[PDB]
Symmetry: C2
Subunit: 204 residues, 2 copies
């Protein structure tokens, strides 16, 4: 927790493969646990993203709110299976840890079997992200924590795309809620496909 008594630089790196569409996203910014504030800018370095930006926000640092903080500097592994309803599945594996002074989130993401001309691959989701409390329980078989939550993404037409997340975390914890509010925006001077992201994370 010593490390989170102020502003911390963040580097995020996502190597992704969705139906054979590979891409690399680099995120940069800072987090401040004293106020729970995350400010990040992400760049789809490899051209247009084959999936909607909102579908990657949960994959792209719960430390900035404590099992997450006390795992540092060594860090924690975050594994996750994200089922999109009537559609394919992300599988993700990430290490969150300190390198130098810069909390790094390094992620591998594999997306398998989703409809072309569907909400994800057809880019039919609105550029926003809505917040519900997440239940973080002890997972004492793996000496860590687990959580299960669904996420509602709004669709262009008016429908909703559900995305059921299952996640585990282990190092390299009494039950509690974690709430995350998220604004997504664009830099006006940025030519590249990108996402500006602002998050506030608190714990009940």
């Amino acid at each position: 927790e010593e490390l989170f008594t102020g502003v911390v630089p963040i580097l995020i790196e996502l190597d992704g493969d969705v139906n054979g569409h590979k891409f690399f996203v680099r995120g940069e910014g800072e987090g401040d646990a004293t106020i729970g504030k995350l400010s990040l800018k992400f760049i789809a370095t490899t051209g247009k993203l084959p999936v909607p930006w909102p579908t990657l926000v949960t994959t792209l640092v719960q430390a900035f709110s404590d099992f997450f903080k006390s795992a540092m500097p060594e860090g924690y592994v975050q594994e996750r299976t994200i089922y999109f309803k009537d559609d394919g599945t992300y599988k993700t594996r990430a290490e969150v840890k300190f390198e130098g002074c810069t909390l790094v989130n390094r992620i591998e993401l594999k997306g398998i079997d989703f409809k072309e001309d569907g909400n994800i691959l057809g880019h039919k989701l609105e550029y926003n992200f809505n917040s519900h409390k997440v239940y973080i329980t002890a997972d004492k078989q793996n000496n860590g924590i687990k959580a299960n939550f669904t996420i509602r993404h709004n669709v262009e037409d008016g429908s909703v795309q559900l995305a059921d997340h299952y996640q585990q975390n282990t190092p390299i914890p009494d039950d509690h809620y974690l709430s995350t509010q998220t604004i997504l925006s664009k830099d006006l001077n940025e030519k590249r496909d990108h996402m500006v992201l602002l998050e506030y994370v608190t714990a009940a």
Copy 2:
């Protein structure tokens, strides 16, 4: 230099003794070497300061501009003798180094023999600070660097108070200039005696 590729929190601690008037100043803020920006707030924790705030600015992180950067994380010792003309002398010894992620500047300062009802002890200096280039040479007898510079503080009446600094730095470097521009201000909501300080440091 790895450590200075972004924002870094700064804790400064000055234990001072001037003509037997003891005091402790705590500084907090951040530095960014990529742009050379220093933003600090200092609190005279022990009541009214027996000396003018501008006389302590040089004592209260040349790292944020490289001998200073490459000495990290271990850090460097900064020793200095500040002769005020027709008046007393500060003697200072400080360690600059990383503790956790927070570059710390810990200083001891002893001020000896100055007139009461003089510019320093009588508080006759204007609340500002003026910048001239500082010559940083190699000091190969002590395996470090040295510098000699005077500073002009403006006096209430219109006169000037010269303050001749002699300094040495060694760890725990081709010759070059270092320029530092400084604004001093007050927080409007701060009841305690304090100094807000904003500095830009560059190297020619």
